[PDB]
Design a protein around this ligand. Sequence first.
Ligand SMILES: O=S(=O)(O)OC[C@H]1O[C@@](COS(=O)(=O)O)(O[C@H]2O[C@H](COS(=O)(=O)O)[C@@H](OS(=O)(=O)O)[C@H](OS(=O)(=O)O)[C@H]2OS(=O)(=O)O)[C@@H](OS(=O)(=O)O)[C@@H]1OS(=O)(=O)O
Ligand SMILES: *[C@@H]1O[C@H](CO)[C@@H](O)[C@H](O)[C@H]1NC(C)=O
Ligand SMILES: *[C@@H]1O[C@H](CO)[C@@H](O)[C@H](O)[C@H]1NC(C)=O
Ligand SMILES: *[C@@H]1O[C@H](CO)[C@@H](O)[C@H](O)[C@H]1NC(C)=O
Ligand SMILES: *[C@@H]1O[C@H](CO)[C@@H](O)[C@H](O)[C@H]1NC(C)=O
Ligand SMILES: [Ca+2]
Lengths: 414, 305
Amino acid sequence: PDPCSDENGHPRRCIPDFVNAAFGKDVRVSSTCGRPPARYCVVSERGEERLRSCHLCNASDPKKAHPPAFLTDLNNPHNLTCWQSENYLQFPHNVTLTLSLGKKFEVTYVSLQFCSPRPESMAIYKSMDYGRTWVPFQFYSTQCRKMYNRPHRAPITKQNEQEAVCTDSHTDMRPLSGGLIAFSTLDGRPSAHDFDNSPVLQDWVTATDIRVAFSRLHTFGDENEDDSELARDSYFYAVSDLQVGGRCKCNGHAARCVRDRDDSLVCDCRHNTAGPECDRCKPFHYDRPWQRATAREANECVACNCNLHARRCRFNMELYKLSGRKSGGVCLNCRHNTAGRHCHYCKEGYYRDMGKPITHRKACKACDCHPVGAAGKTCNQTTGQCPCKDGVTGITCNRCAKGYQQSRSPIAPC
Amino acid sequence: GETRVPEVPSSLHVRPLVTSIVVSWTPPENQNIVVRGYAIGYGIGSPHAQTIKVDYKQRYYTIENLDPSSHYVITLKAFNNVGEGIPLYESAVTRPHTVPMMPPVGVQASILSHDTIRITWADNSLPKHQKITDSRYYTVRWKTNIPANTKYKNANATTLSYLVTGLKPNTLYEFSVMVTKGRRSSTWSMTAHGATFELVPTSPPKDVTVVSKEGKPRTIIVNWQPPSEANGKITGYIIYYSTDVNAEIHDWVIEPVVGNRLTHQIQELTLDTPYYFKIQARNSKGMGPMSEAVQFRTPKALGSA
Ligand SMILES: O=S(=O)(O)OC[C@H]1O[C@@](COS(=O)(=O)O)(O[C@H]2O[C@H](COS(=O)(=O)O)[C@@H](OS(=O)(=O)O)[C@H](OS(=O)(=O)O)[C@H]2OS(=O)(=O)O)[C@@H](OS(=O)(=O)O)[C@@H]1OS(=O)(=O)O
Ligand SMILES: *[C@@H]1O[C@H](CO)[C@@H](O)[C@H](O)[C@H]1NC(C)=O
Ligand SMILES: *[C@@H]1O[C@H](CO)[C@@H](O)[C@H](O)[C@H]1NC(C)=O
Ligand SMILES: *[C@@H]1O[C@H](CO)[C@@H](O)[C@H](O)[C@H]1NC(C)=O
Ligand SMILES: *[C@@H]1O[C@H](CO)[C@@H](O)[C@H](O)[C@H]1NC(C)=O
Ligand SMILES: [Ca+2]
């Protein structure tokens, strides 16, 4: 069964399956251990005593390697696979993760599962364009104003709904392993209750790229000591899983996202819509203005009525309002010698053939008015009679009436 | 084979409620990898909040104790002793706690024929004279007034005017209309009476008995019951009699009877003669069909044997 159409065939809103846009994707990271191989340390608390078990990170050996591939691979709780940064890349230095999707996605959540303790300061950004410019999404810090120049736990108002909020909720050093930072886009937003009709939030959830930047590391305090060799080897960022959950942005006009000719992901547009995100109407389907599909009403594009005489059409708002917000389409360059808004009549100097219908190619016949005999170029649309000069008779005005003689003067033919 | 992690399930479906969410699924396509059970990860915004593990036989689960009007993201992982497989993601918003028309006026009966009657009604809800812009449907019922507790015959109509099909002539019918849109429904409208037009009878008169008059043998009394399919008001009856049954209809002696009478006397007849009788009913429209021939021999005279 087709999701974009009903049992009778009438169009209905269709959305692509909820997926993890991050899963199985290449993630560009600023830092990764094992190049050259270096020792790292895992701290395991025994009450007050801080026991430490040190291991080796080696990119060259898959058994000891922690590549950025481990961020989006199958997250198995039994066999955890996590990417690991270089040891002690403390503030102002920051480890950056960059996920690129060549398609607009309405992101609902962004979540990071950690192998090491969660950072003190972490930031999430999004990209509206394909990675060119960045827009802040969500901030996490114990010092919100001093780190990201944003107030701590800011109240989301109807005015600034697209505001990137800073919180201290998932900043805690403990748990030292298995810690999770999950960001829900629509959480706290006032218009969320009616997202389907909220363009402000429809835009907020939209993103092509996701950037996660870990600014500050959580430390016990041994970092600034003389014997800091073992201590600094214990601090790093390690992420077992990265999730970017949401839906392919098709504006409710496509049931699935399909790979295009340029190998990029695009919507399999339905409801006579076109473009990557089904943002526009299919050519010649400009009868009414484009609109995003809602659960109540599917806003399919309507084809211009041209009586099978035009391949191209335009739109006029004034005319659309005149029809009572029903139709505003105007046909362009009517073929088969026709004219009008909908090519509903014959061209100036062509008569309507009453036998054949208006949809047919042979609907209009040429007047064939004589340049000398006839006075005018346009003939009668019903009978086919051309306005002949004084003393001239006939459908084409080529005959002289009984009693009239053909003369040499062009003004008076008979 | 428990060496590999279970594959992604074949399908995932979510149905939302007030404080519940019904998760329904199908097992993974590849039956080669052994599946021990399923993991359901649910939560507001992200599916990380809570996790529920069910057996491999299970194909449905109802997530209880949920907040109303909240967007939930659900995940389904197939798992065994080596780990958890690729999840199927699906999201649903819980329905709110809130759980939920005037009958037509001016119902008039317009009789056209013996089998068809036009029913017209107006609405106070609509601003214009007639407006069909909303998804509303009318239901019309009909029954005979003569029999007690007659079964109602319902028919759904799109427009304000409807023609009733398959009706009996000379019978009073009552009509009721009701407007229906969505879940809410209105009661029946004021009953409008409509009597069907008269028609030519289709059944001959029943229980035809011929018995000779007591004392007078030349005079005979013919008794008959009214026909079942009268199709109108009885205006009269015509009795046909002839000594030969094989004779043409117009050769039989015509005897006219009035509508009120159901018994007639035929005088001046030959004694010891076998007579045949045929009766037909009549109304304002036409002439009904004739009854079967009834043989009756007149009594013998005092003379001879
Ligand atoms: O990280 S280093 O490779 O530079 O080794 C530094 C010290 O770590 C020990 C034990 O100290 S502890 O962790 O505090 O317990 O060895 C441990 O590290 C290596 C590599 O770790 S890894 O997870 O395997 O990647 C392991 O050696 S090996 O498997 O690569 O060959 C040790 O495992 S094993 O003993 O060989 O089986 C591992 O030991 S443990 O299980 O954590 O206890 C020390 O080595 S040890 O004294 O021989 O155990 C290193 O300290 S040392 O003074 O340099 O010897
Ligand atoms: C790193 O891995 C490579 C490949 O297994 C190995 O040759 C090399 O010796 C390793 N380095 C260390 C320090 O173990
Ligand atoms: C298990 O996890 C390790 C890292 O701890 C990884 O190298 C390996 O690829 C994973 N999978 C298997 C099948 O061992
Ligand atoms: C740290 O993050 C900033 C952006 O916040 C970036 O410009 C910079 O290159 C990153 N790395 C370092 C070492 O500053
Ligand atoms: C049509 O009328 C019948 C009467 O029995 C009823 O059961 C049915 O539901 C009606 N159709 C609709 C669409 O309601
Ligand atoms: Ca992983």
